[PDB]
Design a protein around this ligand. Structure first.
Ligand code: E0Y
Length: 352
């Protein structure tokens, strides 16, 4: 006839390994919730909120790893009253890993910019990490994950972004088992926008670096690329950081300075385009060979004014394409060579 109220929680009494990637909630049937408290092992209460109709209570703040929580709830209805007490334990990680996402929040980047999520620890379960990363695009475009190394995963579409696209990255790793008892230390979120299409093409046959903005040629720079014994790899490069001046140190990229292809020299107006250490930069010493002969260690050498032009007008995520050199092809897992991996292979990924 008149039923007693019933209490249902999203955890159960005695549960262990409860993941903290989601709130805890309680629902009343045949009655309303009169009070709900949740405390940790130390008696400290957890913040929560009861819905206005009295039917549903939920935690509202982050739940902690390695905690024993006690939930007390009372429901009242015309049929009488019901009270329950539940204790559960949350996940106890063996390790925590912190994600770091690029590009930065609010940035405007070029059409070649991948989403990058780098953890500070090796990820045993790549599939769990990919599943925990939510990418929103507008206009919507399909994309896919691919791992550069054990710690950094990249996401991009099949073709270069459409200018004007919003990209939203929710790395929702808090409470997620990323393998072997390694859980996400925190969530991170970033949002960025794709700007103009900027593609600069260096053609060894002509020795010209041509900059096209939304398809229109805006600059033609005589360049000197890698001499035969240190060639510039062909392929697609993503623009990385830019520097007013920087000491280029070959040992940074694996080559002892004191070795025959080593070097250590202060350089102006330098835009990095590969982790292997290719840059567009000012080369006053080879102005005469630019547009004619390859003389560099791999860099795209241009005039000082053209290098400053490049610094001022080309942004992170814009594209440099190198063609017809005697080099090989830039490795797809360079760090900035993601677009050299064919789409079918990128889309199949490497989560295992
Ligand atoms: C690009 O080619 C690189 C490297 C970071 O990939 C740098 C290294 C040089 S330094 C070279 C030796 C001394 N040089 C002079 C004449 N000052 C040039 C470089 C290059 O121009 O070859 N660029």
């Amino acid at each position: 006839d008149l039923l007693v109220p019933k209490l249902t929680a999203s955890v159960t009494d005695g549960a262990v390994g409860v993941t903290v990637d989601a709130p805890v909630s309680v629902t009343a049937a045949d009655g309303v919730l009169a009070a709900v408290t949740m405390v940790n092992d130390n008696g400290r209460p957890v913040a929560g909120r009861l819905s206005p109709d009295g039917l549903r209570w939920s935690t509202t703040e982050q739940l902690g790893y390695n905690r024993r929580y006690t939930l007390n709830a009372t429901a009242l209805g015309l049929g009488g009253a019901a009270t329950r007490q539940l204790t559960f334990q949350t996940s106890s990680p063996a390790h925590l890993t912190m994600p770091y996402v690029m590009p930065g929040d609010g940035e405007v980047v070029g059409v070649g910019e991948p989403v990058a999520i780098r953890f500070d620890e090796n990820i045993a379960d790549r599939g769990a990490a990919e599943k925990a990363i939510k990418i929103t695009t507008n206009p919507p475009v399909e994309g896919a994950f691919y791992w550069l190394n054990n710690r950094e995963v990249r996401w991009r579409p099949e073709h270069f972004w459409k200018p004007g696209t919003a990209v939203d990255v929710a790395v929702n790793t808090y409470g997620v088992d990323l393998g072997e008892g390694m859980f996400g230390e925190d969530n991170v979120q970033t949002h960025f926008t794709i700007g103009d299409e900027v593609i600069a093409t260096a053609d060894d046959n002509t020795k010209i670096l041509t900059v096209r903005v939304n398809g229109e040629v805006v600059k033609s720079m005589p360049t000197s690329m890698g001499k035969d014994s240190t060639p510039t790899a062909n392929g697609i490069y993503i623009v990385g950081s830019r520097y007013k001046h920087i000491i280029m140190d070959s040992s940074t990229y694996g080559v002892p300075v004191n070795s025959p292809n080593g070097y250590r020299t202060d350089v102006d107006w330098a835009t990095q385009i590969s982790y292997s250490g290719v840059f567009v930069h000012s080369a006053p010493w080879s102005v005469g060979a630019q547009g004619h002969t390859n003389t560099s260690h791999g860099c795209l050498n241009v005039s000082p004014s053209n290098a400053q032009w490049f610094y001022d007008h080309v942004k992170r995520g814009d594209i440099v394409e190198v063609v017809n050199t005697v080099g090989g092809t830039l490795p797809g897992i360079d760090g900035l060579g993601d677009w050299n991996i064919p789409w079918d292979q990128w889309r199949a990924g490497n989560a295992k």
